[PDB]
Amino acid sequence: GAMVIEKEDVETNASNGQRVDLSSELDKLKKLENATVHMEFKPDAKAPAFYNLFSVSSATKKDEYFTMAVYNNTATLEGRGSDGKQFYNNYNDAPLKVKPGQWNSVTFTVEKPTAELPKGRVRLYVNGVLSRTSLRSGNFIKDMPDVTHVQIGATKRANNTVWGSNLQIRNLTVYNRALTPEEVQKRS
Ligand SMILES: CC(=O)N[C@H]1[C@H]([C@H](O)[C@H](O)CO)O[C@@](O[C@H]2[C@@H](O)[C@@H](CO)O[C@@H](O[C@H]3[C@H](O)[C@@H](O)[C@@H](O)O[C@@H]3CO)[C@@H]2O)(C(=O)O)C[C@@H]1O
**Which atom of ligand 1 is least distant from the CA of 91?**
1
Q: How was this structure determined?
A: X-ray
CA distance 177 to 132: 19
Cβ proximity of 21 and 169 under 8 Å: no
> How many Å apart are CA 167 and CA 12, to the nearest integer?
5
CATH number of residue 162's parent domain:
2.60.120.200
CA dihedral 65, 66, 69, 71 (to 10 degrees): 60
Amino acid in the structure at residue 1: G
Contact between 41 and 168 (Cβ < 8 Å): yes
CA separation for the pair 77, 97 (Å, rounded)? 13
- Domain of 143, in residue numbers: 1-188
- Strand-pair category, 121-126 with 74-80: unpaired
According to DSSP H, which parts of the chain are helical? 26-31, 181-187
**Rounded to whole angstroms, how far apart are CA atoms 148 and 158?**
10
Residues in the chain: 188
Residue 181 CA, ligand 1 centroid: distance in Å: 32
What does the alpha-carbon distance between residue 132 and residue 44 come to, in Å, rounded to a whole number?
25
152: phi then psi, degrees, rounded to nearest 5 = -95, 135
Residue nearest to atom 1 of ligand 1 (CA): 78
Best CA proximity match to 185, nearest among 109, 76, 134: 109
Q: Report the residue among 50, 62, 155 best suited for mutation to probe ligand 1: largest number of ligand atoms under 8 A from its CB.
A: 50
Of 24, 33, 29, nearest to 4 by C-alpha is 29
Q: What is the DSSP letter of 28?
A: H
* Angstrom distance (rounded) from CA 156 to CA 59: 7
| Number of domain units in the chain | 1
What is d(CA 166, CA 159) in angstroms, rounded to the nearest whole number?
A: 21
The amino acid at 131: S
Report resolution in angstroms.
1.8
- The whole-angstrom separation of Cα 113 and Cα 185 is 24
What radius of gyration, in Å, describes the C-alpha atoms of the chain? 15
Tell me phi and psi for residue 140, to 5 degrees: -160, -150
What is the CA(12)–ligand 1 centre distance, in A?
22
Q: How far apart, in whole angstroms, are the C-alpha atoms of residue 169 and residue 68? A: 14
Pocket test for ligand 1, best of 18, 78, 106, 122 (most atoms within 8 A of CB): 78
Other Cβ atoms within 10 Å of 22 Cβ, number: 21
